[PDB]
Amino acid sequence: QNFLNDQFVIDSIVSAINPQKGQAMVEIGPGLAALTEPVGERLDQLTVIELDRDLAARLQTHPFLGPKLTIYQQDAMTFNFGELAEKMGQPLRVFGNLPYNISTPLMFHLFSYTDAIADMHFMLQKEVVNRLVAGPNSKAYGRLSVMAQYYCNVIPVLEVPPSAFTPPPKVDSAVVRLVPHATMPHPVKDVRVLSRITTEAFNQRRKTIRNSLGNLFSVEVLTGMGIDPAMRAENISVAQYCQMANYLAENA
Amino acid sequence: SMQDPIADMLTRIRNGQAANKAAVTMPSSKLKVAIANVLKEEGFIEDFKVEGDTKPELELTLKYFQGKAVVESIQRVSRPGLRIYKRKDELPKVMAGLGIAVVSTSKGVMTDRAARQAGLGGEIICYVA
Amino acid sequence: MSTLEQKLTEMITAPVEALGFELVGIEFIRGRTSTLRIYIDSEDGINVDDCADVSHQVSAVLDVEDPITVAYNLEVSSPGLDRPLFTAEHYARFVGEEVTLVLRMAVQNRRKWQGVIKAVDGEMITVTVEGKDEVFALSNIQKANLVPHFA
Amino acid sequence: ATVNQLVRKPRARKVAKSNVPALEACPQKRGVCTRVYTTTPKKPNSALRKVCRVRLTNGFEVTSYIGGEGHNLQEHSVILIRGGRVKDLPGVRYHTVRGALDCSGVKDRKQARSKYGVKRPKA
RNA sequence: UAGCUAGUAGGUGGGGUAACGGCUCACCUAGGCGACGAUCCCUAGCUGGUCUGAGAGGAUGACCAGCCACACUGGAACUGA
RNA sequence: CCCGCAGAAGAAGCACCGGCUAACUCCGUGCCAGCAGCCGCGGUAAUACGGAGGGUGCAAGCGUUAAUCGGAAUUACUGGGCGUAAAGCGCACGCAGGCGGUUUGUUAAGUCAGAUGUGAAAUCCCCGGGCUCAACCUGGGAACUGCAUCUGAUACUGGCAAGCUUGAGUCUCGUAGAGGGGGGUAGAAUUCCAGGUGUAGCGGUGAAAUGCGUAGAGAUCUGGAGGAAUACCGGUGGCGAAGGCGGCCCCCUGGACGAAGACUGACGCUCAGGUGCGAAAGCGUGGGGAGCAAACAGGAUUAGAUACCCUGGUAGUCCACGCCGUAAACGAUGUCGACUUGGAGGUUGUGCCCUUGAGGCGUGGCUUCCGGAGCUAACGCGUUAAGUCGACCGCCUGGGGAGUACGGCCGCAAGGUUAAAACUCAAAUGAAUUGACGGGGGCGCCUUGAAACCGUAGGGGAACCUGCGGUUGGAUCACCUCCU
Ligand SMILES: [Mg+2]
Ligand SMILES: [Mg+2]
Ligand SMILES: [Mg+2]
Ligand SMILES: [Mg+2]
Ligand SMILES: [Mg+2]
Ligand SMILES: [Mg+2]
Ligand SMILES: [Mg+2]
Ligand SMILES: [Mg+2]
Ligand SMILES: [Mg+2]
Ligand SMILES: [Mg+2]
Ligand SMILES: [Mg+2]
Ligand SMILES: [Mg+2]
Incomplete structure (x- = not known):
């Protein structure tokens, strides 16, 4: 201490x-x-x-x-x-x-x-x-x-x-x-969706997000959001993370 | 692989001398015979001989003076990695003239003492004392 | 950066004013040594000798009652040919004059500046920053220097 | 290693800087005292050191040590500096010259006085 | 600092110089150069010498002698041996 | 330049004096501050500060700075290193390059000898001369290491030609082996499912809790599933370039060693670029997922606990096919060849003798531990060198900053790779000696119950915590003076 x-x-x-x-x-x-x-x-x-x-x-x-x-x-x-x-x-x-x-x-x-x-x-x-x-x-x-x-x-x-x-x-x-x-500045439908998206992604940060967030979303969703699924979790700004969170929440 | 048959005989002389061996032996070669002859002619060994047709062997009888090896230093200056040549005057002095250098001249191998008074520079094999 | 800046100022003021000199600036740095830097001026002049005097005095009169002494050393100084300056009254002597400033506010329209003093407010320096003009609080700045034109 | 390596790449003898570079090999240089100050070296160290920030004609600005007794020396004043290391101080590799162009000799001193810029007593 | 180069490399023929020569121009060939460092960029006038060094070396080219280049800056060209 | 005249008459300073470094004591001084190239000097005397006397050195000079060389072998041509101080590429193959056994002829490029032309003078050096001397000037020689050409010389090297069998390499016959690749298959084991018998507990810890069970768990029997790994042999043991390789059988396949000849005929070694192999982690694409388990989740512990504990658990761990390209990838020890005391083993061929079967003489290969000489800073190494040496390659040049920046390259990304400098410090470092050790431990005495890292991936109050697999380099810290 x-x-x-x-x-x-x-x-x-x-x-x-x-x-x-x-x-x-x-x-x-x-x-x-x-x-x-x-x-x-x-x-x-x-x-x-x-x-x-x-x-x-x-x-x-x-x-x-x-x-x-x-x-x-x-x-x-x-x-x-x-x-x-x-x-x-x-x-x-x-x-x-x-x-x-x-x-x-x-x-x-x-x-x-x-x-x-x-x-x-x-x-x-x-x-x-x-x-x-x-x-x-x-x-x-x-x-x-x-x-x-x-x-x-x-x-x-x-x-x-x-x-x-x-x-x-x-x-x-x-x-x-x-x-x-x-x-x-980032309006979100819920924070638990952010928290779980981010933990899944960062629990898998060495592999492609197709092999992280694409274990839940499709590649056509991700590219539909304008996100390249071939990126790694540590390429991704909080902006598109909250966009994913909104997508999860509103499509659930 | 083997790349210096002369340094091989000289290191055999050294190692044999240090091992107190009465003689040492080598696959003979014309140059080694001539070398062995000039260093017998300066008294650094008891004797040398060659034995056997086809494959040859050259045996060197190592000299020991009272309690000790006669040769105490032998080293070869013309590395096959870089050869060495000297003019008739540039022939070096070994132990300030106490020792010998071996010169291959265009009139054969001899001591530097012979070569300088013969007026021939040449290639230098080695130093001995 | 200083300990107990007012206490320090008064403990320093006693030998400064006993010598009839004037304080200008007090600043401390924390690093390989940690060390205290005193700016003094007197408009008749400050020699190296005047620094030597007040420094040997503070080297006694502070030390014997030091609130802290970590890695300690100090110097006393004339304020340079480009001069550090600290108060509304300082900038007010120097209205119309070129300056550089670094700030406790740290934000774009960058709060690191080159300026010409436009006017002084009771709370603020107003200044021709970048050939524009703008105003910064005496509290939202943290260090400033004057006539940086002289190298 | 091998002679063949030495002909493939010769011996790289190292370069070294001037440790007193702001002279550019001038035996001395002139400047102006951009600020002047006096420091204790340490918590118990009583031996005040007298030091100047000085800008040279070449536009370098550097620390230089003020040897011996006091002077007129004050920021608009001008100074001649020469090589010399204060061993105990960090990086102080320039001494100011006693009896230089804006600099007094140590009037009192009777010993080594050609260092201290001061003439033979007038006896 | 790795590739470089189209009068570029070579040829024929015309023109050109006091003289040989892409010197130059027409055509014609597709060469020529470079990791044995070309190309590119930085830095420098060169040398006899000079200083140091036991020597090998290292440093350096002020003065004096030889060579080179330049003459307010950038362009030309006249005349004349 | 000589000569006359008067008079010591007109003419000495500057450094330094603790050591290096010739040269010292009084005085003050107070760590006031001075002093400083470095080591360092100082409070109550200071031979180091300032002053005085005294001294030493150099002198019309004397000191300071700067700059180059020296010292510095400290880039080591001459004339250095690389087990641990800095340094041997993680490994291998291989192009260019370097290097190359042996015999005879030939050549004469290198090389050698001699000649000839040239190498400006000045400078340098020698031998002289001339300024009263000297500096300075100057005669003559020497020197100008070289370049060119001619002439010989033929050892050695190179070229050419011819051979040679010792190096290299092919063949025939055997031998040992977790060498590799591919495909089957077995007995344990865990988990899981399905019953069966059965019943209040189980499970877990330091103890707990979370967890599981009355829907029957746990236990124990049977039957089935599935994925993974090969108890024991197994070793100071074999194979493999290294990384690595371990149930069993088959199939394909690499290398090695011995035997005894036979055969080719120097076919060789090394290797910058280049090419390829390359643990563990991670990535790519599609499967699989028993057990284990970063992350995560939940229960505990603790001043706090992110740890250490437990109950869970994803990635991952597995497979095929891509990538990455690093590891204390370390024998911290480049590759190849020759030589040089011994000794005790291990392992695997082989010959001869066996009286057989044991034995006992030999004789290769591989390999372990001692240790002589020699080597080494020391530790140690030691015929499997770190001894004695030959050829080539790689690498280091104080400590940090920093294997970091930047640029290039490479990579899917991680990152890899190549790789600075400013700036900063007087060290940084290796080995080894003596006390502490200390906590002791035994019996005042002898003397120790006392983890670090590497690569890589992820957490993240810390330094840190966690997973994977490799390495061992498994720990301390250090105060009052001296001359012959
Ligand atoms: Mg023509
Ligand atoms: Mg030397
Ligand atoms: Mg002395
Ligand atoms: Mg060394
Ligand atoms: Mg090391
Ligand atoms: Mg290696
Ligand atoms: Mg040969
Ligand atoms: Mg020949
Ligand atoms: Mg995978
Ligand atoms: Mg793996
Ligand atoms: Mg890097
Ligand atoms: Mg390993």
């Missing part, structure tokens, strides 16, 4: 977040006081979840912070952010740092709240961030990056050396921000 150590990049992250009132801000994983303090400072009042009840006591008893935040002590994947968006008057800014096994769940739970979230701002490991922003025709591309880029516009904020962290890992990591689309 990790949390940051050096004021230069702490200050860079909290300043790049631009946390002020007129925003429905909520931290998750406040962790070490050093990086939760500047955001709880700049916001006149701030909401937070900590997963740990002991750290939640450490910070809630801290007079810089307990008087200056409202604090919650539970697994955030239980947490009803759609009601917190109502209680905070406008859709949320959700942000912070974590041990990040939970990362994959965080994204899906955030996406379960794409209406209730205004934006997300989080640190993550280099490979998963570069995947999350990957262009369709790259080895870094794939199913989770597809779903992420489907739900939101995604934007690297800044990148951080491993010696910057309190227990310094071996692994460089970056803060990234993302934005649930105000209207989906």
Whole structure:
């Protein structure tokens, strides 16, 4: 597990977040006081979840912070952010740092709240961030990056050396921000069709899509959509993936 | 495959000398006989002989002086990969003249000591001491 | 990039103003070393010697109460013949003058720029970018430099 | 390996750069101090180093070391530079010349003074 | 930097030069060149020499002597040995 | 140029002084900062900073920078390397190219000898001369390694001609073998189906859970299905170029080794380009799918767990036909040929002796482990060299950046392939020695219960996790001074 150590990049992250009132801000994983303090400072009042009840006591008893935040002590994947968006008057800014096994769940739970979230701002490991922003025709591309880029516009904020962290890992990591689309540029009939199309395709990414999505559609459907079935799964943009999803859903 | 019948006899001389053998033997050839003769003529061996019609064999009787081999160095400069020729004056000195080089001249094979005073350059076979 | 930028500014201000010099810029870089770069000017002049003085002072007066010291070293500098600049008042001294800018906003109609300062707003730099004109917030920029014409 | 290989391809003796290339083999070069600054080398290292960004007549701009005591030297001022490596510093391969065209001699110094650009005391 | 080339390669005949010659022009043949590096691109005037080196080598061609090319830039041509 | 006149009178500096490197001590200084080519110098003395005295060197100069050669053999013609330091193509065949046994004649291209013409002068070098000397100038010689031509010489090489049998290779007879290709077939085994008997459990783990069973599971009997693999022999064992090859029989088919002759007559070796073979993974097209199993899914575990555990499970794994073209494809060891102490085995021919049957003398081939000489940085290698050598090919030239960019080529795609540089560092590295080891382990003493990678494909909080198959290179880390 990790949390940051050096004021230069702490200050860079909290300043790049631009946390002020007129925003429905909520931290998750406040962790070490050093990086939760500047955001709880700049916001006149701030909401937070900590997963740990002991750290939640450490910070809630801290007079810089307990008087200056409202604090919650539970697994955030239980947490009803759609009601917190109502209680905070406008859709949320959700942000912070974590041990990040939970990362994959965080994204899906955030996406379960794409209406209730205004934006997300989080640190993550280099490979998963570069995947999350990957262009369709790259080895870094794939199913989770597809779903992420489907739900939101995604934007690297800044990148951080491993010696910057309190227990310094071996692994460089970056803060990234993302934005649930105000209207989906890719309208879809359902997301489960996307999720299964993408998993089938990426479970078979070395073979032709005739030997991946063509295990379900015909070649004449695919070419009828304007898609060459002789491509590989990692040639395919989210645009034609959502077109396939709509085709599956509407022809079923 | 075999591509230097002369380096073969010289390496047989070396290896036989190092193995303390009283004599060593080779498939004979006219040039080897002439070589064996000039190095007997400079005393580097006890004797040489040839035995048998049709296939021939040339035997070299290796010389040991008190406790040791007489030849201590023998090496061939005209690689079949690149031949070597020298003018009458350019005939080199082996061990500053203590040793011998073997020269095939257009008047036959001989020592460099013979060849320089004979005024003939030629092809150079090898050095010995 | 800096730690506690206001605290740092005041701790630096004490020897700067004791020397009667003026601050201009504070910036830190993180890399093979991690290091702090101070721009000071005084319009009578800054010599190498004036940098030497204030640097030996901050090398004591900051260090003894450092909020952080990771890989640390620092330098103090005159702001160059192409000068880094940081505030509304700076750009306001230099209205009509050619500039380059790089931004915390990072979007097409590219937020990396060459410009001539058109006018200053309380929140923004207005600038003749690309021979067009446009305006960028003091908060949506992050670094800028002036008279890049001088190599 | 074989002589036949050596005639098929001769010995490739390597080239090497000038390690001080912005001179173009001029014994010295002139420039202007595009900025000037002073640095501590390290967290415990107290020995301040005095350094300049300087643009040469040839349009190169490079770091150069300021040896010895202070000067007038300030950004519109002009400098003669020559080869010389500050071993402890990264890539600093150019020394400024004491007693050059905009550069004072070390007035105090009584030793090695032809390095430091300063004339015999007037006794 | 792998292929290159149509007066290109060769021939006959006409024209042309002080002189041989696609030098050039008509026809005629389909050649000619190149991985023993042509073609293409970069860089350079050349040499006796010079410096270094134990030597082999390496570097280099300022001065002096020989050869070459150029004369505001790009085109021609007059005259004359 | 000589001569007269007066007077030491008019005329010395610049580096450096810890070591390399000739030359040292006082003083301050505080790591203030200076010092610097490098190694490095310093707080309380510093022979290294600054100052002083003292010293050393060079001198009308002395230092600094730049630049070329040197040193540097550090591109290794002379004069280097490639098991592990960088380096032997994954393997093979083969064109061009290089190289080539042996005898005789012939030729005379190379080669050798001699001559002749030429090789500008100057410069260089030698021997002289001349400026008072020197620099400088200059006489004469030598030198100008060469080129051309003529003349001989004939060993060697090359050409030509003729042969030769030792290299190469054909034949006859045997021999051993998971060599390959094609086609049948068997006994185990798992799963599955169909019953039959039967009944509350089964299953799984550390324990659980998910899972399965009262629609009868599980178990056990019978009968059937289907796909895959060959228990044991089996080995420090054979075959194969390498990759690799293992139930059995047939069919086609490659190579090898021994035997004893016979035959051809140097037909040879190596090999840039070229061509082809080439594990595992993955791809292409169409089948198959038992068992296993990336991905995935679900249950657990853990601070978290993405792992490790379990219940599932797709691709894949199989087949035919295309492709890819890489592997620690490694003996990390290019191919071919000759030579050079021994010793104990293994395996497979063969000869002679067998008193037979065992034996015992030999004698090929292949192969394993020791080890002499020699070699090697050392480790080690060692007649199957890493010894001694001959011919040719491939490859390396500090560490990173980087087998990465870019371009070309190639590939269906993955990617492959060829392949930089800027930039950056004073190392990077191999072997081996001594302490730690340490966790010990045995009995204060001797001394160890203490995975890395390769290729490739996919997941992806990590470094990482997973699948396939290959390799073994199966781990540590390192502080207070010195002269004869
Ligand atoms: Mg004509
Ligand atoms: Mg030398
Ligand atoms: Mg000394
Ligand atoms: Mg070497
Ligand atoms: Mg190596
Ligand atoms: Mg090999
Ligand atoms: Mg011959
Ligand atoms: Mg002959
Ligand atoms: Mg397939
Ligand atoms: Mg396979
Ligand atoms: Mg590549
Ligand atoms: Mg293998």
